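An example makes the point: we let one protein speak, the chain in one-letter code, the fold tokenised, and here it is:
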Amino acid sequence: GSMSISISYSTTYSGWTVADYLADWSAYFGDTGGFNPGPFDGSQYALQSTASDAAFIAGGDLHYTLFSNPSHTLWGKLDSIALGDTLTGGASSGGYALDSQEVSFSNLGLDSPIAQGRDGTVHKVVYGLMSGDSSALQGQIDALLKAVDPSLSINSTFDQLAAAGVAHATPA
């Protein structure tokens, strides 16, 4: 359903496990953009690597506390993560996009309240992904996959997830 995780993937990665792909993408990002609409809140939070072309877009209803207690917290609803290369667009252009969208995860269903601060799952998922540690995102995807089918996991390949009705190949 709409409460079920849905994954898109370039056929480039059809034989990759989700864990292997996420670990390598977060290394590609390493240890332009912002919020749409912004300045500090948006339906998208997008970031470009300085280290490589790597870029992500977090989608949902996201909030950044800036200097307000609890400081430097990203909280709210995280519905989607899109991973790939080269951030484009912004508020002005009808939203952020990726020049090359490698993999996306939708219907994540994550919602972290401000009171949890940087302890929130949304904060940890997004901060990890851009600080060379996709472990938090992997844990949430693993749980969502097992909610559909317990023989699935982040160690499933993208084409195994397609065969299980979760994932969808896109052109390379």
Summary: Residues 1-172 form one domain. The beta strands are 6-10, 33-37, 41-48, 54-64, 74-90, 95-106, 110-112, 167-170. The first strand starts at residue 6 and ends at 10. The chain has four helices and eight strands.
